């Protein structure tokens, strides 16, 4: 029997996701790695408990997370049922479908067959009635976006997803998806792109403006560039009373354009450091220019 | 085994809720207080039985009613299943989500998350398939109304709420909510404002006109100003006495004086308190003189 | 174990219900009487089996049928489950809500509360997932039609009713209800008015035109004027003359009265009742002679006028 | 316990079904024959296993398939549950309602009563929550298309069909059905017409243009003309068989290849009474190209032998 | 919603059933007739409500009661569920298997097949988890008693019957049934013989002593001789008239005397009355107002039965 | 919907199974062959309907019947649910465990593991709460009989089998099994040995006396010697002539012979199509054999070395 920390909501900053009423924590936990059947459940248990104790109320999954595929969802579902029975309504749980999950022509992409069948498998694996957010995980150029949007819409209407999002869509396709979902009176909630100090396709392409103009939120995937977050950038971090990682997360969160950043963990202690990034979210024009200069150099 | 009074529909006055075909009793029972786990179930049982025996067919709950939060809904659900199995379809049951219910950022406000997760908790706690009326309990300035209205719409479409209402919304926001719900072919049924002799924001702001112009009903919350309507207060009590009424009765009769108010929400800690409040129906007429003197005493006492 | 007559679909005439694809039998069985807890179940059983054996595939109920109220539905549900498990998809089952069913302000009328709660009770009493036709049983002047039409719509969308109908609505209200149901992309299927030789409000008011112009079907309630078509001396004299006309046509009074309603494509079906199985055979023979001459029609009207 | 061939997706060609994202195998298995209670379940089992092992992911049923009616669905449901529990989401399963299924006025046609009741019976017989494609099996002149389309729409909304199709509708009726289904924000997925070398109403009537212009797919029913395209009239059939041989194909293979010659046909519906028949038909994919000359000579032999 | 009369337990006499702790009402309602699908449910409803309002807590069914067979149980199950939800644990419900119920060689008799399949059908029809009493309805000479007794035992062990009884078994077979049931640690609760003023095989055969000696109860079936003991050779008619006069001298109707006679001593646990309408029950319960008979009376009753050849 | 022949109980003879109250039909249908997944369900359906129409109320299965193993039980279960929902309680259904069913050391023999798990599989395959008779299908010399008897006992107590039997047990083991079951207050119901005109081990070994003395029934397996009873040739010809003199086919005489006295409760016939049943049940028309006839049958078997 497990009692969550009563102060869990005291430090975490929460941000409204676009124009919606849903507040995500500034740091969200992704289950991309470390939650498969190759990892011991006890490590996983400790991570989830700690995350929630730090006020991280958002846990981001996908059908194919593991390895093997589906195992993150299964393990999460088990821990949910053992430790979080009394807390599910305090959690925002996402899953996704779009990458290779199972073999053959219905196990990948953006068809209504794949998306609705996969959502059903995801719900079964996790032991849920609905996910809070269901995503199309990537663009499928061979499925009309009408079909994808309409599958997402069915997910909402049937009560299997409270809200929907998209991941790794260009600005043009994001804009079309906003429009198609509006034909069903569904606002696109959120976009999940890969975005970090070293990879600014999001700024450069104008995706952040498309998101803001449509009131869609943004949650940054691989905010630490998969480990890379040179010596000079670390010195700048130290001058701010931050580790490199903390500065990198603080940088994404410096302004209201990013809703949240997706961190990962293989053990509980790694989470504490990352949430401290909230202690210092301000950057001077000078600092920003010097950061850009070191990256260019 | 409990048999409800067969004359229960003989004395209560029922009023159409706005333009709708749903008739609320002129007095409705709110479970704001006295239905928590801090109160004995047997007292609670007597109150519900009596309420229904007097023709009060409407019972108004909210997720956070208790204490502790949710307990009113749990206790109501238990009494419903023991004493009202055969009578549920004679009852109008409401609940609501908007105030602090559970901790964290999804436990409060007007988001689709909170409202739909709360309606599910409420339905479970009460052992119901659906509520007759589901409310947004208050304005959330940080949630777009589109999201709130659309959560309410989902509740109706999925068969979890027969009708929907709002509580403590300004005339402007009420008007927008009527419009947004109309986009889903759902008429807003009812508005629940706090309204009593001492608190007329409802008249002054023009909310009653907005309601009437949109065919939305109105049910007064805290019609007795939380006890105050049980020097200027003494004078008002004297006016009540001249009418053959307690202060409480006059205060209820005043809200019901005209067709603008659909119902008033009374509470009770014991059965006998209900009979007195329903007598307010015996004298619902006020002269222009009486109304002017009531207002004058409120001015003079700075109430 | 009970095996329906394999020739059951060989004689009955079926008519498309307005512009819809649903065919009703020209005679349907109403459970208004004789199916309550005051009547023996075995008599009930024999009636239903016989009705279906004659090709009558439509059974028309209402929440308050009995007595006591609900009992027709309960009994029907029981007989459905014992004798008709394999035949339910060959039946059209209707129920209704609108008259006094249970006490208090939610037990009557046309509110969403009453209609949806009552459909649920009806489905539970009858042991069904859905009825084929759900009706608003009468006009409620105090409920906006928007609310009633929208309850009917919910019934269809939620899978509790395949189709919807109304009963005893004026031509104007019928027309509005068609329009409101069209806002939900639902066509009104059928109207059930009281209509027989002696009661032509339906013709006179222009309800039949409204129905035809909107492609809504029509099913005649009390087609035998509650017995009269089976009181002063002038009344009795005219009834005797009508009976003689029936005889000249090789028909009983009842048969002529049913044939008359069915003489043209304006009436989809007529609602017969029965307290015993043998009463059904005679009524379905009405189909043998559905033609009336201009002269015959004029003489019928004349005897009704004279009496 | 049965493990499907791991190379099953290596040889089969899949085609996008109209403008949709759903890819059907170029060859699909129809259960029109050989899956009734008159046929032994073991033969049936072998056929389904082999079909899937060859990459045929689409199995096409209808309420009345058997004999007796409903039995193909029952038998398929039983095999699905024994051999395909782990594979259902790799399958596209269709059924249909429109021909005579059960007696009386609700057991046939295009009414909402018939279609929704029949879909429920089909789902129960097959042990499924939903079919991937639900069809109206043919035109009913006496039911307004609004009613039919709206039943199909309910099927999708209620989660009993992922997609919907029609079978043996004229171009005009197909076009109207596309429009009516679009009022519910449902795109028509697919049209199933009877089409083969000897029966070209599809080409002649312009149905193929209607389909393409609306992004609807096409799956050819009776692609082998119920045997005639397998090994005066007889003289022309012999000459067509010789053309097949010159292409390194059996008659059957050429007949299937011909339907698949261009991107207009999404799939062809083959049948089988035993497993070995399937292998030959999928080899049709080895040669899908026809010259203008070849096409003209095929047509000529058909004209000369009056094979229309 | 239906509230049973709160005074229902004030007037009825209850008697311990043999040596057991189960008290049956002196008058029990049998559903042999008037509870079939050939009778209106509303009449049935009124009878049950009234019966219980009079303190009659025991309702005696059989698989084949109707007509048609099974319909009493079905109708009873419906009324139980509508009007007696809150009261089931205040009722003793019996059913039975032994006469022709369904066709073929398993639909009759005393075999384990028939009895256990029938009990399951009876429970399903009535919507019950268990009956309070399950009976073998009659002797089957072709089934060994070991088999019948063991089926009854299974019924108890499996929780489908609280207690078991037999109907219309001779004293010898009753005695063997007591012994066989004792091998399973089950006491035979009750015996249901046909017994009334005109049919005394029970007394004559010594069944009542076998019952008493084994602590088994006794409930009389057809206590009114199917109408004869209420309102044919001359001798018959004359004697029946004289018996009616004796009833009148006691301030009783014939029916009441007939019931009072069976209940005259502690040997008979209960008598099984029937009813086609609610008012018939009240009169029968008044029998309890006069249960005493003098030796002289008993002799004069016997004499009139002898003189009128009423056996 | 299928209505069984109402005269089904008019011709069949039923016999009490030993000292028990259970009456088996004189001919029972074994599902050893023709009910596997290799056979068409429609043929199977016809056979079961016809059997029951002829008053054959007993259907004898085993876990391994098919092929493939289990399929007879699955097919039977499906036909039971479609055509016999109303008739289950008019049927006696047996299954068995003892031969090779599934691989490994728990898939064969007489252990408690194998027997109880198999009964659970058989019940699941057939869609039943219980079988009427559960058999140990053969002797297992390596399981103590105490274990086997106790598994059978558990089957009865837990309500999964109404009665129990054994198949192909010697008289001495049969006797021990009667004793072991008696320790649980369970009477052995029935023994199923192979027995026919050509194979009399049952008589010779004294099994029929052991059965009778313990009140256990007997049901003959392979009563037609797997076809042979439909030098050697010369004797078979003479036996056929004797059959003809009796107005019987060879098969009929062979079945009539087994049934000639009260020693045999029933015989197990099989069918690949419905018409084969009618002939076999006619064997009941002539169940009497003179001493002379019996002596001549024995003589022809001796002369032809048909043992």
Curated annotation (Swiss-Prot), chain C:
It is an enzyme of class 1 (oxidoreductase). Its EC number is 1.1.1.-, 1.1.1.2. Keywords: NADP, Oxidoreductase. Induction: Expression is not significantly altered upon methylglyoxal addition. Expression is decreased in dose-dependent manner with glyoxal treatment. GO terms for molecular function: oxidoreductase activity, acting on the CH-OH group of donors, NAD or NADP as acceptor. Disruption phenotype: Cells lacking this gene show 23% decrease in the amount of acetol. The deletion mutant shows sensitivity to glyoxal. It catalyses: a primary alcohol + NADP(+) = an aldehyde + NADPH + H(+); hydroxyacetone + NADP(+) = methylglyoxal + NADPH + H(+). One of its GO terms (biological process) is DNA damage response. The record marks 60, 65, 96, 137 as: Important for catalysis. NADP(+) binds at residues 32, 60, 65, 167, 192, 222, 224, 226, 275, 279, 283. Homotetramer. Homooctamer. Belongs to the shaker potassium channel beta subunit family. Aldo-keto reductase that catalyzes the stereospecific, NADPH-dependent reduction of L-glyceraldehyde 3-phosphate (L-GAP) to L-glycerol 3-phosphate (L-G3P). The physiological role of Gpr is the detoxification of L-GAP, which may be formed via non-enzymatic and/or enzymatic racemization of D-GAP. Also contributes to cellular methylglyoxal detoxification by catalyzing the NADPH-dependent conversion of methylglyoxal to acetol. However, the catalytic efficiency of methylglyoxal reductase activity is more than 2 orders of magnitude lower than the L-GAP reductase activity. This is L-glyceraldehyde 3-phosphate reductase. It comes from Escherichia coli (strain K12). The lineage of its organism: Bacteria, Pseudomonadati, Pseudomonadota, Gammaproteobacteria, Enterobacterales.
């Amino acid at each position: 029997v497990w009692l969550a920390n009563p102060e869990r909501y005291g430090q975490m900053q929460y941000r409204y996701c676009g124009k919606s009423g849903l507040r995500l924590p500034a740091l969200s936990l992704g289950l991309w790695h470390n939650f498969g059947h190759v990892n011991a459940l006890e490590s996983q248990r400790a991570i989830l408990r700690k995350a929630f104790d730090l006020g991280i109320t958002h846990f981001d999954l996908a059908n194919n997370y593991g390895p093997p595929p589906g195992s993150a969802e299964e393990n999460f579902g088990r821990l949910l049922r053992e430790d979080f029975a009394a807390y599910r309504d305090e959690l925002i749980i996402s899953t996704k479908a779009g990458y290779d999950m199972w073999p053959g022509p219905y196990g990948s992409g953006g068809s209504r067959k794949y998306l609705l069948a996969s959502l059903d498998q995801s719900l079964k694996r996790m032991g849920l009635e609905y996910v809070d957010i269901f995503y199309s995980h990537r663009v499928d150029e061979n499925t009309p976006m009408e079909e994808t949007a309409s599958a997402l819409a069915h997910a909402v209407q049937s009560g299997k997803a409270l809200y929907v999002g998209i991941s790794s869509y260009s600005p043009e396709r994001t804009q079309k998806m906003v429009e198609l979902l509006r034909e069903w009176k569904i606002p696109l909630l959120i976009h999940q792109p890969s975005y970090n100090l070293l990879n600014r396709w999001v700024d450069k392409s104008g995706l952040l403006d498309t998101l803001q103009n449509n009131g869609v939120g943004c949650i940054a995937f691989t905010p630490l560039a998969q480990g890379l977050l040179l010596r000079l950038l670390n010195e700048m971090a130290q001058q701010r009373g931050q580790s490199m990682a903390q500065m990198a997360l603080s940088w994404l969160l410096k302004d209201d354009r990013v809703t949240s950043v997706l961190i990962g963990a293989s053990r509980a202690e790694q989470l504490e450091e990352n949430v401290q990034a909230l202690n210092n979210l301000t950057f001077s024009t000078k600092e920003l220019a010097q950061i850009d200069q070191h990256i260019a150099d």
